[PDB]
């Protein structure tokens with residue numbers, strides 16, 4: 001079939017949904033595209049090259065809320081961006097693990113830059129603004145990884161039914177809010193003992 | 195060599211530090227112990243059985259702060275427990291990924307139970323107390339996974355030097371505090387609009 005970057009990646013993502021990250025190989029990607037292994041190598045050198053490309057494309061394709069709207073508060077921005085990141089990671093099987101394994105990308109670097117400007121304009125230092133964006137990312141990554149992996153005593157028994165009744169979204173959205181408020185309390189305090 | 199559970203796991207953890215999770219196989223575990231593959235199978239049926247056992251032992255061995263001290267506040271407990279969890283996950287190469295892949299364990303279930311009682315005594319519902327413990331865990335897991343994987347424009351350039359100067363600990367400890375305060379603000383509010 002056709003072997004430009006876009007088609008290769010469409011085929012690799014679709015293969016990702018069939019096999020998961022551990023299962024995904026170039027040899028099976030070559031089968032799906034109706035081509036021999038050495039043809040594929042011209043286009044994609046190894047699994048690691050494939051996964052880096054996949055990590056960037058999952059976000060380009062689906063991480064739709066990467067930038068603040070006109071007028072938007074920093075709280076609201078961190079919320080919408082976390083929700084969008086989460087959703088993009090959930091869209092493909094082992095999506096979170098595909099993301100974790102990769103350093104960020106020339107275009108992802110101008111987006112995070114704009115975010116860091118945004119947070120500085122709203123009164124964060126570079127430091128505290130970086131800590132805020134990192135905490136959000138790490139919390140989200142961790143929640144999604146746990147959700148994607150999974151799928152007694154009393155209190156637990158009831159506990160692990162309120163966590164199962166849902167796919168993890170409620171637990172995530174509540175913790176998101178706790179995190180944002182915690183940042184707000186940090187920020188608002190300036191140099192007072194908080 | 196000697197093949198009781200303790201020695202097998204000591205050898206598997208030491209092998210873990212040489213190869214990482216993707217590299218670790220029963221066949222290499224058998225080599226390290228000076229035994230043939232079918233001897234090992236009697237003791238450990240597969241990689242998945244090995245990893246589940248490893249996940250439980252990393253925590254038994256090193257997650258020293260699993261329970262509150264006499265008198266301790268819930269804030270302080272969540273802090274010390276997060277720090278302890280983080281440290282135990284960092285102690286072995288791919289430690290976080292070994293943990294993520296496993297459901298919890300008969301003894302881990304009585305510990306989380308005691309935690310959930312602890313949070314209820316200090317005024318959390320089961321729900322909100324579960325959300326708090328989960329958020330802490332997910333944040334910590336995500337921070338550690340990112341730290342273990344890793345090892346331009348201006349603001350970033352300065353950003354990714356304050357994140358590198360350290361191993362991730364400062365970013366983690368700051369976000370930890372933001373999370374705990376966020377919970378405190380939730381809890382204290384009761385039914386008022388917060």
Ligand SMILES: CN(C)[C@@H]1C(O)=C(C#N)C(=O)[C@@]2(O)C(=O)C[C@@H]([C@]3(C)OC(=O)c4c(O)ccc(Cl)c43)C[C@@H]12
Nearest residue numbers: 059063066081085104108111112133134136137354
């Ligand atoms: C979820 N958002 C908060 C961010 C985002 O919109 C991204 C996009 N597109 C990311 O890559 C993110 O989701 C993301 O995972 C990266 C993350 C960040 C701060 O940017 C970095 O350059 C960087 C780094 O070099 C090491 C660790 C971390 Cl947390 C980062 C920025 C994230």
Ligand SMILES: CN(C)[C@@H]1C(O)=C(C#N)C(=O)[C@@]2(O)C(=O)C[C@@H]([C@]3(C)OC(=O)c4c(O)ccc(Cl)c43)C[C@@H]12
Nearest residue numbers: 160253257260275279298302305306327328330331
């Ligand atoms: C870091 N601590 C906060 C906890 C802890 O002390 C543990 C131990 N030992 C865990 O297993 C923890 O670190 C941990 O990872 C588990 C986690 C929890 C709530 O307990 C569960 O039974 C459970 C579950 O079934 C699904 C998701 C989650 Cl987050 C959980 C409890 C964690």
Ligand SMILES: [Cl-]
Nearest residue numbers: 001002003007
């Ligand atoms: Cl074609």
Ligand SMILES: [Cl-]
Nearest residue numbers: 001002003004
């Ligand atoms: Cl072509």
Ligand SMILES: [Cl-]
Nearest residue numbers: 195196197201
């Ligand atoms: Cl011996």
Ligand SMILES: [Cl-]
Nearest residue numbers: 195196197198
């Ligand atoms: Cl023996």
